[PDB]
């Protein structure tokens, strides 16, 4: 029992972190097989960030201008290429610690773990979600660029995020491992504002199921609702609309607890309308939306 | 910017997790050098837990009754001993992945990361604190026993907790790595109730400093207070008394923000008396107490 914001064990990803330096800029790289992936803005100075022409800046760089250090040993760079907003640096040595891996592009609402790194060294691990506005609410300082987000399925690491930028609002933007940004963000120091950060409804419901499983049941009411009636309330509270696909995904949690998905929707509707009244659910005074239904099942079943 | 409940990278500890089985009971063990540490209740059946005589039960066990598996390979047990509530199983092979380590007994209010494990395999990592009532609010299922709590200082892992038990209230109890329980808990399935779970005041103040550093400043007021006046309020709200030692420990955060510790105490006093009024601090609607002043500095400075 108990329910925590749990991250995946980070060891498999720690074995891939390297430091990449180009000129005077240093950030993190991800070493998988004989390729090091890193944000393309490793070639920029702080002044270049205001209006960078990456293709033009990259012409002035050769393989020997990219310094890659793994632990305390230098890797030899034998090739370089730009794919969207990431650089792929071919090295002469395959990472001996390369885990089984995939590159995946996640959908908004999906969660992942982040291994925050500085100078190719891991500082910490935390769990977050891709927000509906395609930002992440991370914890990143200068030099954290190139830190990655991932999920693990038994022994396969699915890398889904590489950190690139902090917006003026303190929220974070980045790319998948093919270098495509999540959302409309561009790798330039210009006015980029995030859209509405709505609440991931299907995740809130999963966390309410997690609360019932772990004994917190005060919020369960005598009501039910319909998808359309619930969604009228969800729109009013800046919650994402719930679809039948989300109801289907909550099926296992509904079966485990014996609480129909629409009855849980009616409990959530009352919590939105009445508030918490100073009470807590799973030690929180807000409705938590960074646990997917898959996360709740995984944590409540002990998947390793 | 951004502030997350961050755990230490778990790789160094994942390299130490093994499975220990005795008879029909299986739990986790921690393999460091040529010794495997695990809860002594690995020798008990579910029926033995009601009233166990560990010394008597251990007489019926020989080295070959303890099965230790690391990954998928079996370790040879060449000795066994009981130290307080843990068993130390001497194996014939030193763990090649043994990190630099220390065994430390933490004080209430101190935080650590937990690598939750099942069958010697890591499931996840999360951050928690030793509560003032010597319980931890973890996320542990049956078979998680022997999972460990730790802190990392550059390359040295200080192990501080080994999981043993879940109380009927859903909170957790365990030992240090010498087998001594934190608090008054005993490894027996009997009525053990936890004492008052008070709020770790010095941690709340550190997290308020973290909020100011990260831009959340609405709660700062025009007031100051004294240690004695603040403590009258803290006692009323089940907060731990703040001492001059705690004020000293908040010195670096006070210097970074320019906010005197007693002025932050006055802001916290007003938050306790007035509540949040539906507002949030660092995305929380409650005052967070599982970040120490050291954690706030570490996260806000990027220590690797
Ligand atoms: C490199 C830089 C940045 O956001 N980096 C950072 C990333 N994370 C946390 C940060 C905390 C504090 C300071 C910078 C942070 C700064 C200049 O403007 C830009 C513009 C675009 C891009 Cl793709 C990166 C950047
Ligand atoms: C072994 C056992 C236990 O608490 N273990 C567990 C530890 N963590 C999470 C649990 C979640 C669900 C089921 C059990 C959990 C059960 C019997 O009573 C006792 C009594 C004493 C001790 Cl030292 C251990 C135990």
List chain A domain ranges: 1-14+100-197, 15-99, 198-301
**Residue from B15, B299, B9 nearest A8 by CA:** B9
Residue B237 CA to residue B304 CA, distance in Å, equals 36
Q: Is A145 part of the annotated catalytic residue set?
A: yes
Who's near A150: CB < 8 A, 6+ residues apart? A8, A13, A112, A113, A115, A157, A158, A159, A160, A161
B119 to A304: CB separation less than 8 angstroms, yes or no: yes
Closest ligand 1 atom, CA of A190? 20
Residue in B2, B125, B141 closest to A10 by CB = B125
| Region class of A33: left (phi > 0), else alpha (psi between -120 and 50), else beta | left
Instruction: Quote the ligand 2 centre to B181 CA distance (angstroms).
Output: 14
Report the C-alpha gap between B22 and B26 in whole angstroms: 7
* DSSP summary character for residue A211: H
End-to-end CA distance of chain A: 17
Closest CA to B141 of A6, A273, A36: A6
Query: From the CA of B84, how far away is ligand 1's center (Å)?
Result: 51
Are B304 and A172 in contact (CB < 8 Å)?
no
Chain-chain contact of A7 with B124 (C-beta, under 8 angstroms): yes
Residue A126 to residue B1, Cβ atoms within 8 A:
no
Residues of A in contact with B272 (CB under 8 A): none
Rounded Cα distance, A242 and A231, in Å = 6
Q: Which helix (H) or strand (E) holds A209?
A: helix A201-213
Q: How far is A176 from chain B (nearest CA, A)?
A: 21
Q: What's the CA gap between B128 and A4, in Å, rounded?
A: 9
**Are the C-beta atoms of A171 and A136 separated by less than 8 Å?**
yes
Closest residue in A to B289 (Cα–Cα): A283
Burial level of B229, CB count in 10 A (0-12/13-18/19+)? middle
Per the structure block, which two tokens stand in for B250?
A: 């908040």
Name which of A18, A11, A159 is nearest A77 in CA terms: A18
What residue owns the CA closest to ligand 1's atom 2? A165
In the reported structure, the alpha carbon of residue B117 is separated from the centroid of ligand 1 by a whole-number distance in angstroms of: 36
CB atoms within 10 A of CB A91: 23
Which pair of structure tokens corresponds to residue A214? 């772990």
Rounded CA-CA distance A238/A225 in Å is: 18
**Separation CA B127–CA B41 (nearest Å):** 25
Pick the ligand that lies closest to the CA of residue B172: 2
Distance from CA of B59 to the nearest CA of A (A): 33
> Under DSSP, is residue A149 helix (H, G, I), strand (E, B) or coil?
strand
Task: Tell me which long-range contacts A104-108 makes (C-beta under 8 A, separation of at least 24).
Answer: A104/A151, A104/A158, A104/A159, A104/A160, A104/A176, A105/A160, A105/A176, A105/A178, A105/A180, A105/A182, A106/A130, A106/A160, A106/A161, A106/A176, A106/A182, A108/A132, A108/A133, A108/A134, A108/A200
What are the strands of the beta sheet with A86-91, ordered from one edge?
A73-75, A66-70, A17-22, A25-32, A35-39, A86-91, A77-83
- B275 contacts A279 by C-beta, under 8 angstroms: no
Measured between alpha carbons, how far is B213 from B258 in angstroms, rounded to an integer? Answer: 10
What CATH architecture is A1-14+100-197?
A: Beta Barrel (2.40)
Q: Do domains B15-99 and B198-301 have the same CATH topology?
A: no
Instruction: Give the C-alpha separation, B7 to B112, whole Å.
Output: 8
* Atom of ligand 1 at shortest range from CA of A165: 4
CATH class held by domain A15-99: mainly beta
The separation between CA A200 and the C-alpha centre of its own chain, rounded to angstroms, equals: 14
Could B126 and A8 be called an inter-chain contact, meaning their C-beta atoms sit closer than 8 Å?
no
From atom 1 of ligand 1, which residue's Cα is the shortest distance away?
A165
Q: Is A128 a catalytic residue?
A: no
Question: Using a CB-CB distance cutoff of 8 angstroms, which residues of chain B are in contact with residue A123?
Answer: 6, 9, 298-299, 302-304
Q: Is the CB of B269 under 6 A from ligand 2?
A: no
> B67: part of which helix (H) or strand (E)?
strand B66-70
* The ligand 1 atom nearest the CA atom of A46: 17
Cβ contacts of B123 on chain A, cutoff 8 Å? 6, 9, 298-299, 302-304
How far apart are alpha carbons A247 and B285 in whole angstroms?
28
- Experimental technique used? X-ray
Q: Determine the 3-state secondary structure of A113 from DSSP.
A: strand
Smallest Cα distance from A108 to chain B, Å: 19
Q: Which residues have CB under 8 Å from A46's CB, separation 6+?
A: none
Contacts of B304 in chain A (CB under 8 A): 117-119, 121-123
Contact B143 A6 (CB under 8 A): no
Residues 6 or more apart whose Cβ sits within 8 Å of residue A112:
A106, A127, A128, A129, A130, A149, A150, A151, A160, A161
| Shortest Cα distance, chain B CAs vs residue A296, angstroms | 12
Can you tell me which residue has the tokens 């609607």? B285
Residues in contact with A114: Cβ distance below 8 Å, sequence separation at least 6, in sequence order? A7, A125, A126, A127, A128, A136, A138, A147, A148, A149, A161, A163
The two structure tokens encoding residue A19 = 């430091």
Under an 8 A CB cutoff, do A9 and B124 touch?
yes
CATH for the B198-301 domain, from 3.40.50.10780, 3.90.1150.10, 1.10.1840.10, 1.20.140.10: 1.10.1840.10
The protein residue with its alpha carbon nearest to ligand 2, atom 13, reads B142
Asked whether A179 and A40 are in contact (CB, 8 A), the reply is yes
B142 C-alpha vs ligand 2 centroid, how far in Å?
6
CB A3 within 8 A of CB B139: yes
């Amino acid at each position: 029992s108990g329910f925590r914001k749990m991250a995946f064990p980070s060891g498999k990803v720690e074995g891939c972190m390297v430091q990449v330096t180009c000129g005077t800029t240093t950030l993190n790289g991800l070493w998988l097989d004989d390729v090091v992936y890193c944000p393309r803005h490793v070639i920029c100075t702080s002044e270049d960030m205001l209006n960078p022409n990456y293709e033009d800046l990259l012409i002035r760089k050769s393989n020997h201008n990219f310094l890659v250090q793994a632990g305390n040993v230098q890797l030899r760079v034998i090739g370089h290429s730009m794919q969207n907003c990431v650089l792929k640096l071919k090295v002469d040595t395959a990472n001996p610690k390369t885990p089984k891996y995939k590159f995946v592009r996640i959908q908004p609402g999906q969660t992942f773990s982040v291994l925050a790194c500085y100078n190719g060294s891991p500082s910490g691990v935390y769990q977050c979600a891709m927000r509906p506005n395609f930002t992440i609410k991370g914890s990143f300082l200068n030099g954290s660029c190139g830190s990655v987000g991932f999920n693990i399925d038994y022994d396969c690491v699915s890398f889904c995020y590489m950190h690139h930028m902090e917006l003026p609002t303190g929220v974070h933007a980045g790319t998948d491992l093919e270098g495509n940004f999540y959302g409309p963000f561009v790798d330039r120091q210009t006015a980029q504002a995030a859209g509405t950060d709505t609440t991931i409804t299907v995740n809130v419901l999963a966390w309410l199921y997690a609360a019932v499983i772990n004994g917190d049941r005060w919020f369960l009411n005598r009501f039910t609702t319909t998808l359309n009636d619930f969604n009228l309330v969800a729109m009013k509270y800046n919650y994402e609309p719930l679809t039948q696909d989300h109801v289907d995904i909550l099926g296992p949690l509904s079966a485990q607890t014996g609480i129909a998905v629409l009855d849980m929707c009616a409990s959530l509707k009352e919590l939105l309308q009445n508030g918490m009244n100073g009470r807590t659910i799973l030690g929180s005074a807000l409705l938590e939306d960074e646990f997917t239904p898959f996360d709740v099942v995984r944590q409540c079943s002990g998947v390793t």
